[PDB]
Tab-separated table of C-alpha atoms in Angstrom:
chain	number	residue	atom	x	y	z
A	1	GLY	CA	9.620	25.549	-0.299
A	2	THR	CA	8.581	22.092	-1.479
A	3	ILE	CA	10.132	18.727	-1.030
A	4	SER	CA	9.321	15.768	-3.296
A	5	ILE	CA	9.906	12.302	-1.941
A	6	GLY	CA	9.696	9.091	-3.872
A	7	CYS	CA	9.288	5.857	-1.968
A	8	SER	CA	8.125	2.281	-2.104
A	9	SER	CA	4.753	1.281	-0.700
A	10	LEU	CA	6.216	-0.426	2.345
A	11	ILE	CA	8.141	2.743	3.275
A	12	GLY	CA	5.132	5.015	2.650
A	13	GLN	CA	3.134	2.935	5.070
A	14	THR	CA	5.692	2.153	7.797
A	15	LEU	CA	8.627	4.606	7.887
A	16	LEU	CA	7.568	7.827	6.253
A	17	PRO	CA	4.496	8.724	8.392
A	18	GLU	CA	6.567	8.831	11.590
A	19	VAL	CA	9.378	10.729	9.826
A	20	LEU	CA	6.966	13.304	8.428
A	21	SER	CA	5.193	13.791	11.768
A	22	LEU	CA	8.583	15.054	13.035
A	23	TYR	CA	9.519	16.808	9.854
A	24	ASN	CA	6.274	18.751	9.604
A	25	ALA	CA	6.392	19.663	13.333
A	26	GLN	CA	9.917	21.095	12.899
A	27	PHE	CA	9.461	22.625	9.433
A	28	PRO	CA	5.799	23.569	9.118
A	29	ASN	CA	6.246	25.874	6.108
A	30	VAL	CA	7.608	23.146	3.819
A	31	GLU	CA	5.128	21.655	1.357
A	32	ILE	CA	5.603	17.909	1.072
A	33	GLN	CA	4.827	15.801	-1.993
A	34	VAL	CA	4.970	12.080	-1.598
A	35	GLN	CA	4.833	9.691	-4.525
A	36	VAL	CA	4.515	6.060	-3.686
A	37	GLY	CA	5.011	3.329	-6.190
A	38	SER	CA	6.735	0.149	-7.176
A	39	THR	CA	10.463	0.468	-6.520
A	40	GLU	CA	11.075	0.075	-10.219
A	41	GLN	CA	8.758	2.967	-11.120
A	42	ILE	CA	10.363	5.079	-8.350
A	43	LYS	CA	13.959	4.535	-9.504
A	44	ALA	CA	12.912	4.967	-13.121
A	45	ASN	CA	11.276	8.309	-12.255
A	46	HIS	CA	14.087	9.657	-10.021
A	47	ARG	CA	14.050	13.095	-11.719
A	48	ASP	CA	10.643	13.717	-10.172
A	49	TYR	CA	12.116	13.481	-6.620
A	50	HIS	CA	14.588	15.357	-4.414
A	51	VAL	CA	14.971	12.207	-2.306
A	52	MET	CA	14.108	8.554	-2.760
A	53	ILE	CA	13.675	5.894	-0.134
A	54	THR	CA	13.728	2.300	-1.288
A	55	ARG	CA	14.716	-1.231	-0.341
A	56	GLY	CA	17.267	-3.540	-1.941
A	57	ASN	CA	20.510	-2.105	-3.261
A	58	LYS	CA	22.015	1.301	-3.637
A	59	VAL	CA	21.018	3.489	-6.554
A	60	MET	CA	23.915	4.037	-8.906
A	61	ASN	CA	25.266	7.552	-9.498
A	62	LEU	CA	23.549	8.915	-6.374
A	63	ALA	CA	24.546	9.311	-2.762
A	64	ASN	CA	23.160	6.360	-0.774
A	65	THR	CA	22.704	6.301	2.975
A	66	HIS	CA	21.962	3.037	4.699
A	67	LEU	CA	18.934	3.487	6.939
A	68	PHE	CA	18.546	0.057	8.490
A	69	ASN	CA	18.239	-3.661	7.887
A	70	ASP	CA	15.167	-5.814	8.467
A	71	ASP	CA	14.888	-9.470	9.469
A	72	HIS	CA	12.306	-11.779	7.910
A	73	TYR	CA	9.743	-14.211	9.315
A	74	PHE	CA	7.901	-17.167	7.858
A	75	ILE	CA	4.298	-16.821	8.953
A	76	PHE	CA	1.606	-19.415	9.080
A	77	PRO	CA	-1.592	-20.262	10.945
A	78	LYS	CA	-1.509	-22.051	14.296
A	79	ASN	CA	-5.206	-22.409	13.611
A	80	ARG	CA	-4.739	-24.384	10.315
A	81	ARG	CA	-2.180	-25.254	11.424
A	82	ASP	CA	1.411	-26.568	10.936
A	83	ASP	CA	0.987	-29.029	8.020
A	84	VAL	CA	2.325	-26.039	6.205
A	85	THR	CA	3.669	-27.465	2.936
A	86	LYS	CA	0.110	-28.000	1.686
A	87	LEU	CA	-0.830	-24.294	2.033
A	88	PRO	CA	-0.366	-21.897	-0.867
A	89	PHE	CA	2.860	-19.821	-0.626
A	90	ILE	CA	2.592	-16.136	-1.539
A	91	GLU	CA	5.785	-15.006	-3.255
A	92	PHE	CA	6.640	-11.336	-2.937
A	93	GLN	CA	8.679	-10.533	-6.044
A	94	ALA	CA	11.368	-8.293	-4.545
A	95	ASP	CA	14.231	-9.067	-6.995
A	96	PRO	CA	15.745	-12.328	-8.245
A	97	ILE	CA	18.329	-12.814	-5.475
A	98	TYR	CA	15.664	-12.453	-2.772
A	99	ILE	CA	13.242	-14.807	-4.504
A	100	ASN	CA	16.028	-17.345	-4.886
A	101	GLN	CA	17.070	-17.053	-1.201
A	102	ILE	CA	13.473	-17.673	-0.180
A	103	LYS	CA	13.135	-20.657	-2.495
A	104	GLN	CA	16.340	-22.132	-1.073
A	105	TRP	CA	15.099	-21.620	2.490
A	106	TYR	CA	11.778	-23.218	1.713
A	107	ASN	CA	13.503	-26.230	0.132
A	108	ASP	CA	15.924	-26.632	3.062
A	109	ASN	CA	13.357	-26.130	5.848
A	110	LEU	CA	10.149	-27.656	4.563
A	111	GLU	CA	9.356	-31.044	3.042
A	112	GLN	CA	8.743	-30.385	-0.627
A	113	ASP	CA	9.674	-28.454	-3.728
A	114	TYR	CA	9.101	-24.740	-3.636
A	115	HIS	CA	6.106	-23.518	-5.592
A	116	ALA	CA	4.565	-20.039	-5.426
A	117	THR	CA	0.808	-20.233	-6.021
A	118	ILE	CA	0.369	-16.489	-5.753
A	119	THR	CA	2.862	-13.796	-6.739
A	120	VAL	CA	2.453	-10.227	-5.624
A	121	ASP	CA	4.724	-7.194	-6.134
A	122	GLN	CA	3.719	-5.213	-3.045
A	123	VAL	CA	4.451	-6.301	0.553
A	124	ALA	CA	1.355	-4.758	2.172
A	125	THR	CA	-0.913	-6.759	-0.184
A	126	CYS	CA	1.111	-9.857	0.684
A	127	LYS	CA	0.453	-9.205	4.392
A	128	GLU	CA	-3.302	-8.712	3.863
A	129	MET	CA	-3.459	-11.923	1.794
A	130	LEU	CA	-1.859	-13.704	4.768
A	131	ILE	CA	-4.310	-12.205	7.236
A	132	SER	CA	-7.287	-13.161	5.027
A	133	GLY	CA	-6.026	-16.761	4.959
A	134	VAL	CA	-5.136	-16.963	1.281
A	135	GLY	CA	-1.879	-18.705	2.274
A	136	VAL	CA	1.454	-18.484	4.100
A	137	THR	CA	4.290	-16.122	3.425
A	138	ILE	CA	7.513	-14.451	4.523
A	139	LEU	CA	7.309	-10.849	5.775
A	140	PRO	CA	9.920	-8.317	6.787
A	141	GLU	CA	9.664	-7.614	10.505
A	142	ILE	CA	8.548	-3.953	10.110
A	143	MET	CA	5.347	-5.242	8.474
A	144	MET	CA	4.517	-7.652	11.288
A	145	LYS	CA	2.299	-5.342	13.382
A	146	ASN	CA	-1.395	-6.195	13.766
A	147	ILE	CA	-0.686	-9.820	12.927
A	148	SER	CA	-2.457	-11.940	15.532
A	149	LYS	CA	-0.060	-13.804	17.801
A	150	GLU	CA	-2.980	-16.125	18.613
A	151	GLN	CA	-3.826	-16.989	14.992
A	152	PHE	CA	-0.262	-17.143	13.673
A	153	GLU	CA	3.143	-18.620	14.303
A	154	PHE	CA	6.293	-16.754	13.326
A	155	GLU	CA	9.609	-18.419	12.407
A	156	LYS	CA	12.731	-16.366	11.769
A	157	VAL	CA	14.245	-16.957	8.367
A	158	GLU	CA	17.944	-17.780	8.459
A	159	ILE	CA	20.152	-19.105	5.647
A	160	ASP	CA	23.341	-20.928	6.556
A	161	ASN	CA	22.732	-19.662	10.098
A	162	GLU	CA	22.667	-16.091	8.793
A	163	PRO	CA	19.427	-14.042	9.074
A	164	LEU	CA	17.823	-13.187	5.737
A	165	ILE	CA	17.953	-9.384	5.736
A	166	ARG	CA	16.913	-6.564	3.482
A	167	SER	CA	18.380	-3.031	3.500
A	168	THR	CA	16.663	0.324	3.195
A	169	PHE	CA	18.467	3.209	1.570
A	170	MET	CA	17.813	6.887	1.183
A	171	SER	CA	19.238	8.056	-2.155
A	172	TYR	CA	19.715	11.539	-3.496
A	173	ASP	CA	21.941	13.760	-5.650
A	174	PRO	CA	24.291	15.507	-3.128
A	175	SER	CA	23.747	18.816	-4.994
A	176	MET	CA	20.171	18.693	-3.681
A	177	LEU	CA	21.555	19.459	-0.152
A	178	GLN	CA	21.739	23.046	-1.367
A	179	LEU	CA	17.953	23.202	-0.856
A	180	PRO	CA	17.393	23.980	2.867
A	181	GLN	CA	14.162	21.860	2.987
A	182	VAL	CA	16.089	18.842	1.564
A	183	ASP	CA	19.151	19.278	3.797
A	184	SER	CA	16.718	19.486	6.728
A	185	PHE	CA	15.032	16.277	5.612
A	186	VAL	CA	18.275	14.368	5.192
A	187	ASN	CA	19.672	15.511	8.610
A	188	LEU	CA	16.425	14.612	10.303
A	189	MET	CA	16.431	11.144	8.710
A	190	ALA	CA	20.027	10.528	9.904
A	191	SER	CA	18.873	11.133	13.523
A	192	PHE	CA	15.594	9.221	13.052
A	193	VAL	CA	17.280	5.972	12.041
A	194	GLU	CA	19.656	5.937	15.078
A	195	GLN	CA	18.340	3.899	18.005
A	196	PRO	CA	18.911	4.546	21.705
B	1	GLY	CA	-3.589	-21.864	-15.994
B	2	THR	CA	-2.584	-18.387	-14.818
B	3	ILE	CA	-4.539	-15.272	-14.175
B	4	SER	CA	-2.910	-11.865	-14.100
B	5	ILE	CA	-4.669	-9.134	-12.166
B	6	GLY	CA	-3.775	-5.493	-12.072
B	7	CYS	CA	-5.135	-3.316	-9.305
B	8	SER	CA	-4.619	-0.190	-7.289
B	9	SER	CA	-2.970	-0.301	-3.887
B	10	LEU	CA	-6.219	0.295	-2.048
B	11	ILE	CA	-7.892	-2.674	-3.797
B	12	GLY	CA	-4.863	-4.922	-3.241
B	13	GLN	CA	-5.038	-4.245	0.450
B	14	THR	CA	-8.802	-4.268	1.066
B	15	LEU	CA	-10.847	-6.127	-1.605
B	16	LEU	CA	-8.583	-8.550	-3.365
B	17	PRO	CA	-7.342	-10.642	-0.387
B	18	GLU	CA	-10.898	-11.657	0.548
B	19	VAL	CA	-11.749	-12.316	-3.149
B	20	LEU	CA	-8.648	-14.457	-3.618
B	21	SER	CA	-9.247	-16.440	-0.408
B	22	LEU	CA	-12.496	-17.601	-2.074
B	23	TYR	CA	-10.995	-17.862	-5.540
B	24	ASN	CA	-8.083	-19.956	-4.451
B	25	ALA	CA	-10.316	-22.237	-2.313
B	26	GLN	CA	-12.558	-22.878	-5.344
B	27	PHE	CA	-9.857	-23.026	-8.055
B	28	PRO	CA	-6.693	-24.243	-6.336
B	29	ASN	CA	-4.887	-25.124	-9.592
B	30	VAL	CA	-4.879	-21.559	-10.981
B	31	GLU	CA	-1.680	-19.569	-10.581
B	32	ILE	CA	-2.436	-16.010	-9.596
B	33	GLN	CA	-0.235	-13.030	-10.434
B	34	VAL	CA	-1.084	-9.751	-8.794
B	35	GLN	CA	0.451	-6.440	-9.806
B	36	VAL	CA	-0.340	-3.534	-7.629
B	37	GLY	CA	0.431	-0.029	-8.683
B	38	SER	CA	-0.712	3.509	-9.167
B	39	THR	CA	-3.968	3.518	-11.109
B	40	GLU	CA	-2.284	5.420	-13.911
B	41	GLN	CA	0.445	2.808	-14.179
B	42	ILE	CA	-2.169	0.019	-14.033
B	43	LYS	CA	-4.270	1.527	-16.841
B	44	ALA	CA	-1.171	2.240	-18.922
B	45	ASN	CA	0.021	-1.383	-18.585
B	46	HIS	CA	-3.361	-3.034	-19.227
B	47	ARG	CA	-1.839	-5.499	-21.747
B	48	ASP	CA	-0.014	-7.144	-18.846
B	49	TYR	CA	-3.354	-8.112	-17.222
B	50	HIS	CA	-6.398	-10.292	-17.953
B	51	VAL	CA	-8.413	-8.202	-15.488
B	52	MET	CA	-7.972	-4.808	-13.857
B	53	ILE	CA	-9.639	-3.454	-10.764
B	54	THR	CA	-9.470	0.283	-10.247
B	55	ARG	CA	-11.324	3.249	-8.800
B	56	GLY	CA	-12.636	6.336	-10.544
B	57	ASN	CA	-14.005	6.046	-14.066
B	58	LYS	CA	-14.563	3.294	-16.557
B	59	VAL	CA	-11.697	2.250	-18.816
B	60	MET	CA	-12.348	3.120	-22.443
B	61	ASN	CA	-12.799	0.282	-24.968
B	62	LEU	CA	-13.062	-2.416	-22.273
B	63	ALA	CA	-16.016	-4.045	-20.570
B	64	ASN	CA	-16.555	-2.299	-17.203
B	65	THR	CA	-18.469	-3.820	-14.301
B	66	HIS	CA	-19.408	-1.555	-11.439
B	67	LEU	CA	-18.401	-3.258	-8.210
B	68	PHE	CA	-19.524	-0.764	-5.581
B	69	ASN	CA	-19.438	2.802	-4.338
B	70	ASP	CA	-17.725	4.121	-1.248
B	71	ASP	CA	-18.607	7.032	1.020
B	72	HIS	CA	-15.978	9.361	2.409
B	73	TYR	CA	-15.211	10.681	5.882
B	74	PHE	CA	-13.297	13.701	7.186
B	75	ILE	CA	-11.111	12.449	10.021
B	76	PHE	CA	-9.468	14.371	12.768
B	77	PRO	CA	-8.142	13.870	16.286
B	78	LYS	CA	-10.691	14.148	19.101
B	79	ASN	CA	-8.545	17.152	20.130
B	80	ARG	CA	-10.420	18.918	18.541
B	81	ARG	CA	-13.012	20.027	15.973
B	82	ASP	CA	-12.228	23.755	16.405
B	83	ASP	CA	-8.450	23.317	16.299
B	84	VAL	CA	-9.022	21.462	12.993
B	85	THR	CA	-8.444	24.418	10.608
B	86	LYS	CA	-4.951	24.789	12.100
B	87	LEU	CA	-3.949	21.187	11.304
B	88	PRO	CA	-2.195	20.185	8.124
B	89	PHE	CA	-4.521	18.669	5.482
B	90	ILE	CA	-3.272	15.624	3.594
B	91	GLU	CA	-4.513	15.646	-0.017
B	92	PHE	CA	-4.878	12.294	-1.733
B	93	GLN	CA	-4.447	13.084	-5.403
B	94	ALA	CA	-7.109	10.867	-6.943
B	95	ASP	CA	-7.959	12.915	-10.083
B	96	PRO	CA	-8.839	16.582	-10.628
B	97	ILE	CA	-12.609	16.309	-10.063
B	98	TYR	CA	-12.165	14.538	-6.720
B	99	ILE	CA	-9.534	17.002	-5.524
B	100	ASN	CA	-11.785	19.882	-6.494
B	101	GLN	CA	-14.848	18.390	-4.701
B	102	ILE	CA	-12.749	18.007	-1.583
B	103	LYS	CA	-11.504	21.586	-1.832
B	104	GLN	CA	-15.097	22.856	-2.240
B	105	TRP	CA	-16.196	20.804	0.770
B	106	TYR	CA	-13.352	22.120	2.903
B	107	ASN	CA	-14.162	25.720	1.934
B	108	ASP	CA	-17.900	25.229	2.561
B	109	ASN	CA	-17.448	23.436	5.909
B	110	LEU	CA	-14.383	24.875	7.649
B	111	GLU	CA	-13.282	28.383	8.656
B	112	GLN	CA	-10.317	28.751	6.308
B	113	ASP	CA	-9.192	28.720	2.672
B	114	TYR	CA	-8.285	25.232	1.486
B	115	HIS	CA	-4.561	24.456	1.473
B	116	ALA	CA	-2.951	21.015	1.281
B	117	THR	CA	0.358	20.841	3.155
B	118	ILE	CA	1.013	17.236	2.201
B	119	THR	CA	0.068	15.549	-1.059
B	120	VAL	CA	0.198	11.830	-1.466
B	121	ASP	CA	-0.821	9.522	-4.349
B	122	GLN	CA	-1.676	6.408	-2.334
B	123	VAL	CA	-4.594	6.061	0.114
B	124	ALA	CA	-2.942	3.583	2.517
B	125	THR	CA	-0.068	6.059	3.069
B	126	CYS	CA	-2.618	8.822	3.601
B	127	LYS	CA	-4.244	6.705	6.314
B	128	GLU	CA	-0.940	5.919	8.029
B	129	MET	CA	-0.028	9.605	7.994
B	130	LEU	CA	-3.366	10.288	9.692
B	131	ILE	CA	-2.753	7.616	12.310
B	132	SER	CA	0.783	8.948	13.001
B	133	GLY	CA	-0.608	12.451	13.551
B	134	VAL	CA	0.905	14.202	10.568
B	135	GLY	CA	-2.480	15.861	9.970
B	136	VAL	CA	-6.157	15.448	9.051
B	137	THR	CA	-7.616	13.933	5.923
B	138	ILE	CA	-10.565	12.428	4.073
B	139	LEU	CA	-10.688	8.638	3.609
B	140	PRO	CA	-13.009	6.314	1.778
B	141	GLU	CA	-14.974	4.204	4.230
B	142	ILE	CA	-13.371	0.886	3.196
B	143	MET	CA	-10.049	2.197	4.597
B	144	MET	CA	-11.498	3.138	7.966
B	145	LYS	CA	-10.765	-0.087	9.884
B	146	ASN	CA	-8.303	0.071	12.800
B	147	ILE	CA	-8.735	3.808	13.182
B	148	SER	CA	-9.454	4.218	16.896
B	149	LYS	CA	-12.836	5.769	17.672
B	150	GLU	CA	-11.197	7.008	20.900
B	151	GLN	CA	-8.521	9.108	19.184
B	152	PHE	CA	-10.565	10.231	16.163
B	153	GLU	CA	-13.785	11.931	15.114
B	154	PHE	CA	-15.368	10.951	11.803
B	155	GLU	CA	-17.605	13.291	9.772
B	156	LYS	CA	-19.330	12.105	6.620
B	157	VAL	CA	-18.508	14.171	3.540
B	158	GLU	CA	-21.491	15.422	1.575
B	159	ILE	CA	-21.656	18.132	-1.094
B	160	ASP	CA	-25.071	19.755	-1.586
B	161	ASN	CA	-26.425	17.055	0.751
B	162	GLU	CA	-25.153	14.437	-1.695
B	163	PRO	CA	-22.560	12.035	-0.256
B	164	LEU	CA	-19.116	12.244	-1.856
B	165	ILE	CA	-18.720	8.790	-3.448
B	166	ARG	CA	-16.108	6.988	-5.472
B	167	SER	CA	-16.755	3.943	-7.702
B	168	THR	CA	-14.796	0.748	-8.123
B	169	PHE	CA	-14.775	-0.987	-11.504
B	170	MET	CA	-13.516	-4.283	-12.783
B	171	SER	CA	-12.408	-3.857	-16.402
B	172	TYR	CA	-11.464	-6.443	-18.965
B	173	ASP	CA	-11.543	-7.366	-22.677
B	174	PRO	CA	-14.673	-9.574	-23.019
B	175	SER	CA	-12.653	-11.973	-25.276
B	176	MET	CA	-10.648	-12.865	-22.139
B	177	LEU	CA	-13.815	-14.661	-20.882
B	178	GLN	CA	-12.740	-17.504	-23.187
B	179	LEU	CA	-10.072	-18.359	-20.574
B	180	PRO	CA	-11.828	-20.509	-17.954
B	181	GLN	CA	-9.676	-19.135	-15.073
B	182	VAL	CA	-10.733	-15.596	-16.050
B	183	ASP	CA	-14.417	-16.373	-16.587
B	184	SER	CA	-14.306	-18.086	-13.167
B	185	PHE	CA	-12.752	-14.966	-11.652
B	186	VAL	CA	-15.270	-12.593	-13.211
B	187	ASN	CA	-18.300	-14.761	-12.164
B	188	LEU	CA	-16.946	-15.042	-8.670
B	189	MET	CA	-16.460	-11.233	-8.387
B	190	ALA	CA	-20.071	-10.691	-9.593
B	191	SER	CA	-21.306	-12.778	-6.592
B	192	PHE	CA	-18.765	-11.313	-4.137
B	193	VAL	CA	-19.912	-7.717	-4.625
B	194	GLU	CA	-23.618	-8.511	-4.003
B	195	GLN	CA	-24.771	-7.897	-0.446
B	196	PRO	CA	-27.155	-10.407	1.243
């Protein structure tokens, strides 16, 4: 049959391709439909999906399985250079708690009032803006590949000596496990997220 | 003041960061808000933006400035061109005309009836699925950085010896040119898209 997956952009570009490589190898007769959007659009449109994968909090009224947590890093140029409070900060607008945690960190760790010059609602765009030198930002660790360790310094973001983390959840209606292609997907994801 | 830009994912990750590096260097007192979404969502929510940048067709009842055209390439692992009809094809669901041109091309150029095993509505995800070996696909040339020429063969997609192209447009209400931060943006984009 067909499986329909709804996910955020970050997930579509970092988690799902490796999952689906496995999934399609094991279950080659399943047709896969992936819809990628803003988290808000995804959750709003949950009736279009058998399974959703998103970051933040659990989705109410559904089963929610914790996939993993990600650390965060403040990223700025070595090359231009470490007088960092004069560079524009790119604020990824995750949700209000996150934004506030980041503002608090910036105020505690740097030497001026927080001010976002650029706001963006997709992490991958935030990363490319960093790479193109628009400004500095905070990225989740899973997005930190292909960032030049010779152009850029990375500082782990901790609040009250606790790492700033964000959770990824897979959410679905448990009734959907009656579809063999969905049960297969969910079982595969439970093994995928375990680490040796 | 503030400028609010709506764009597709592809644009947010490939065109806009270089534009905004320039824009923010020249106009450092403008606050920039970027919303990245599915084209359909972007077009639907046009009242949230001063300017939109999208691919496909012009937006009705707005000014529309053609930015550029992109060629397309069929991409598959260097193991191998004959095996290629056995690999899953990943269908980016741009719009019906595009999908149908791709289907016609596949039928005319390969040894099998067209069938998409995976459908996806974001190009960046399509590219990551290619890189992770889920299957083969067609990408616009602007997305073809960081694809290893040692793992992958690239064949240019032409139909009736005409290259398959897709257009990028900037769309806006011409009244918005009364905002200096928007007029600045639009003038800057007009220079950016010219090639020396």
